[PDB]
């Protein structure tokens, strides 16, 4: 699960924040939102940053249309597969 | 589950957005919000678009009172039936 989290977090930050200098905040930002997604927070108004109802209108830029596809895959893997594998692990 | 998603998404968009011209955004809008509903996002202030606390007051129009009934059925089928069938699948 931790690996799936990073496999999503790193591309998301890289696509949405392409003009960043090196900083330890990068370590926070690749792990922070992907973790809270496991616990029922999809960040609904940040998914499509170029939509009218977006809370991140300044992040709208080239390639940002990729991040909803990434997040859709991420949560499928975490909830539909990995959370329920863990339920099945504990039941058995 | 993907079929249940479309069975909800298409009516929702059609009832709430009746004055749309053909566009590929239609493909996004029939699948987008119904998918994020699977992962704990009910879009609480968009359900009844004619309420005072609604975030979509301009969408208020004829027939829009139908969409809460549709969404109530949709989530019953997805969480109460289909998510727990999948848990039962993995356990067994
Ligand atoms: C069942 C329901 C679905 C039906 C499916 C039919 C598919 C039809 C395909 C339609 C694609 C064309 C639509 C957009 C028109 C082109 C220009 C455009 O507006 O681009 C938009 C983004 O989107 C893109 O740039 C490309 C999107 C391609 C992926 C679409 C899904 C492909 C099928 C599934 C793939 C999964 C794998 C499938 C195989 C397993 C621009 O949007 P923006 O982000 O707001 O950018 C503007 C702002 N900016 C200038 C600052 C950036
Ligand atoms: C292997 C399985 C494959 C699954 C199916 C294939 C995948 C789904 C196919 C979808 C069709 C493709 C949509 C193209 C729309 C183009 C419109 C556009 O301008 O850009 C959009 C595309 O950019 C995005 O970022 C949104 C992409 C949709 C993500 C869907 C994730 C949910 C997965 C669902 C999976 C369940 C599937 C259910 C069963 C079918 C973004 O719009 P915008 O940024 O707001 O642009 C400004 C526009 N405005 C000014 C009007 C606001
Ligand atoms: C246990 C607790 C529940 C008790 C049940 C008792 C039921 C009593 C029934 C009451 C119906 C009458 C109430 C509304 C008065 C009529 C006019 C009105 O205000 O309409 C409102 C909408 O609603 C409708 O237009 C019709 C709603 C009908 C469905 C109600 C549920 C029926 C039972 C269950 C059905 C499920 C299946 C059942 C069988 C299995 C207008 O609201 P709006 O959207 O804000 O529109 C105004 C704005 N606009 C002008 C822009 C549009
Ligand atoms: C098979 C099983 C059947 C289940 C029971 C039957 C179903 C439930 C029956 C409900 C009674 C019917 C309500 C009528 C109210 C009319 C009022 C009105 O003006 O319009 C409203 C009706 O329009 C809507 O869109 C809301 C409809 C309620 C959806 C309920 C979904 C939850 C299901 C629950 C299932 C669990 C049931 C629990 C066990 C009983 C909308 O109001 P508005 O748009 O804000 O209008 C402006 C008003 N304002 C100015 C004041 C803001
Ligand atoms: C493997 C398939 C090969 C690829 C082709 C087939 C894929 C679909 C077809 C084509 C791709 C989508 C084309 C539409 C977008 C082009 C327009 C555009 O500029 O869009 C954006 C950039 O977009 C890019 O720069 C394109 C990046 C593509 C990355 C690869 C896609 C993943 C394919 C994996 C597929 C696996 C499916 C799932 C697994 C089953 C927006 O840029 P802009 O905002 O206009 O720029 C202005 C910037 N300025 C304001 C700063 C000046
Ligand atoms: C099958 C039973 C037969 C149907 C009748 C009995 C059903 C129960 C009750 C009654 C039906 C609803 C009547 C109340 C609303 C009327 C007032 C009105 O205008 O409302 C709206 C429109 O509404 C319509 O145009 C009505 C659409 C009905 C669709 C069918 C209902 C589903 C029945 C399935 C039942 C299955 C139960 C679940 C399964 C167990 C609001 O319009 P407006 O905003 O005022 O318009 C102004 C527009 N302007 C501003 C642009 C000018
Ligand atoms: C298997 C995993 C692959 C991914 C990964 O883990 C292992 O690989 C690690 C490499 C790390 C970076 C290395 C060096 C620096 C330079 C530093 O420069 C100070 C700048 C400023 C501070 O404010 C001075 O004022 C800032 C931090 C940064 C960019 C690291 C960020 C985290 C990264 C990307 C880690 C990431 C989580
Ligand atoms: C089993 C499922 C039943 C439902 C469904 O899948 C299979 O059936 C598909 C038919 C599709 C539409 C066909 C043609 C067009 C015309 C095009 O015209 C360019 C306009 C503009 C673009 O910006 C030019 O500038 C826009 C797209 C649109 C309306 C399609 C939308 C998606 C639809 C509704 C699909 C839907 C998900
Ligand atoms: Na939740
Ligand atoms: Na939640």
Swiss-Prot record, chains A, B:
UniProt name for this protein: Transient receptor potential cation channel subfamily M member 7
PTM text: Autophosphorylated; autophosphorylation regulates TRPM7 kinase activity towards its substrates.
Compartments where located: Cell membrane; Cytoplasmic vesicle membrane
Source species, domain of life: Eukaryota
Organ and tissue specificity: Found to be expressed in brain and skeletal muscle, with stronger signals in kidney, heart, liver and spleen.
Complex formation: Homodimer. Homotetramer. Forms heteromers with TRPM6; heteromeric channels are functionally different from the homomeric channels. Interacts with PLCB1.
Residues passing through the membrane, by range: 1-17, 64-92
Function: Bifunctional protein that combines an ion channel with an intrinsic kinase domain, enabling it to modulate cellular functions either by conducting ions through the pore or by phosphorylating downstream proteins via its kinase domain. The channel is highly permeable to divalent cations, specifically calcium (Ca2+), magnesium (Mg2+) and zinc (Zn2+) and mediates their influx.
Intramembrane runs of residues: 20-60
Knocked-out gene: effects: Inactivation of Trpm7 in mice results in early embryonic death (6.5-7.5 days). Mice die as a result of trophoblast defects and consequent failure of implantation. Tissue-specific null mutants shown defects in cardiac and renal morphogenesis, organismal Zn(2+), Mg(2+), and Ca(2+) homeostasis and thrombopoiesis.
Intervals, Extracellular compartment: 18-19, 61-63
Family recorded in the similarity comment: In the C-terminal section; belongs to the protein kinase superfamily. Alpha-type protein kinase family. ALPK subfamily.
């Amino acid at each position: 699960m931790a690996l799936v989290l990073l496999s999503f977090g790193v591309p998301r930050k890289a696509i949405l924040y392409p003009h960043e200098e090196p900083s330890w905040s990068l370590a926070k930002d690749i792990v922070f939102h992907p973790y809270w997604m496991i616990f029922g927070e999809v960040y609904a108004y940040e998914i499509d940053v170029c939509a009218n109802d977006s809370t991140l209108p300044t992040i709208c830029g080239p390639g940002t249309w990729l991040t909803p596809f990434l997040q859709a895959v991420y949560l499928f893997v975490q909830y539909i597969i990995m959370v329920n594998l863990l339920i099945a692990f504990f039941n058995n």
